[PDB]
Amino acid sequence: CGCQFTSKLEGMFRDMSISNTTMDEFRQHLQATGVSLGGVDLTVRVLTTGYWPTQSATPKCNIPPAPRHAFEIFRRFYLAKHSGRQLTLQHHMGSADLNATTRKHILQVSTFQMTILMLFNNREKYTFEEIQQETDIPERELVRALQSLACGKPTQRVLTKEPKSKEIENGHIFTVNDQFTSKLHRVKIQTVAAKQGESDPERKETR
């Protein structure tokens, strides 16, 4: 090809290069002490806005506490040793491992349901109203993220509810089941990425 979006790919790969350079320099940073904890095992990445698009709107959702501390530390570093540019927060991407606890099976949360798990860490037995009122949580993407732990789950359920039903209600309580059958210590719930057909909307807008 020529140079129209080959530069877009150049920047895309530049972003990965800068991400790994930042990863190794940050590893040197936490090798030299680190004061408090909360940065137990973190993987923060540096990507530019001119090569990774926003997606829809640059959302402004909330952040879980350990992720809050990680984002604050990364922002302080980027404003201290990479000054001249400020970060913008968005909510579409990422992942995390949720250490649950007869064995200790570690879960996986894709940056959306981990706010609900934050509210549960504070105190569980919440409901849809609790996670929609005190979270500043987005639209039905929230429903898809939440149904991952409860709806359509095999016999490794980690977020059980009393009103057993297919459709989602409002006043329904969440609990936890140990589920010793889930011997896997890195069980993940990959409800996202169900298809890759590129639904008409995005195709039409980019056309």
Binding site: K60, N62, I63, P65, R68, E72, L89, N122, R123, Q133, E134, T135, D136
Partner: protein
């Protein structure tokens, strides 16, 4: 009796129940703390602030009780309440991304208090700290314009151009979005003041002359703006633009009213 208030707050934090009942109990505790005075009231309100920012307390409960606390404080005079304002401003950092209306109100109140004690430097420092750009509260254009205007006005008497120049830049950036006519007039007055201050006496004279032929501006304020235009024109770099401005200013009769009437008469009529 601040220890009793702190113990009650700690016990209520671990209590389980409906949101309305907990909010009412916490509001009663806050009212009891306000009824105190001196160091006891200071420590009780500090404990209340610490409890509100605590992770355990509900989001709605925390935000609403901080709002009520911030509304009750202006009743207490300009005193150690300012110290607890600083303490609360420092306190809001784990939840500074969830709610910022309380932070913005605290910053505005602290800036007003500093302006009361002839302190534009510290009021400017406080009011700069507002995160207007974020949009996570999505402040309407009028509020951002008012905040930037206040910072620019504060910086004019603190005498620090660089940051006020950038703030005027951003106020102009978001300026062509706002609605209020009186706010626009105030912004134009402040911009003309900035132009007069920096070196832009000719541009300040132009802006003041443009604002002089207005209606909503007070006749006294219109006369003051015209006097500023006249003084800027006299002090401006003497050239073609200054000559044209002097010729234009030789038409207003309220120019003739002013004491510098003779001065620009001498300027334009050549001597």
């Amino acid at each position: 009796m601040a220890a009793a208030v702190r113990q009650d707050l700690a016990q209520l934090m671990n209590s389980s129940g409906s949101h309305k009942d907990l909010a009412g109990k916490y509001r009663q505790i806050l009212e009891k703390a306000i009824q105190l005075s001196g160091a006891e009231q200071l420590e009780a309100l500090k404990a209340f602030v610490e409890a509100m920012v605590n992770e355990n307390v509900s989001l709605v409960i925390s935000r609403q009780l901080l709002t009520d606390f911030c509304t009750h404080l202006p009743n207490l005079p300009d005193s150690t309440a300012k110290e607890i304002y600083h303490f609360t401003l420092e306190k809001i950092q784990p939840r500074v991304i969830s709610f910022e209306e309380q932070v913005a109100s605290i910053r505005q109140h602290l800036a007003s208090i500093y302006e009361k004690e002839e302190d534009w430097r510290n009021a400017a420092q406080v009011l700069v700290g507002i995160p207007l750009e974020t949009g996570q509260k999505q402040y309407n254009v009028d509020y951002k314009l008012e905040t930037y205007l206040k910072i620019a006005r504060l910086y004019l008497e603190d005498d620090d151009p660089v940051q006020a120049e950038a703030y005027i830049n951003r106020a102009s950036l978001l300026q062509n979005e706002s609605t209020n006519e009186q706010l626009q007039i105030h912004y134009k007055v402040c911009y003309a003041r900035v132009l007069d201050y920096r070196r832009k006496f000719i541009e300040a004279a132009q802006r003041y002359n443009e604002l002089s032929y207005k209606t909503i501006v007070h006749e006294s304020e219109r006369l003051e703006a015209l006097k500023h235009a006249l003084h800027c024109t006299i002090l401006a770099s003497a050239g073609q633009q200054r000559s044209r401005m002097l010729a234009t200013l030789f038409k207003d009769e309220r120019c003739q009213q002013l004491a510098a009437y003779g001065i620009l008469e001498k300027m334009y009529l050549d001597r």
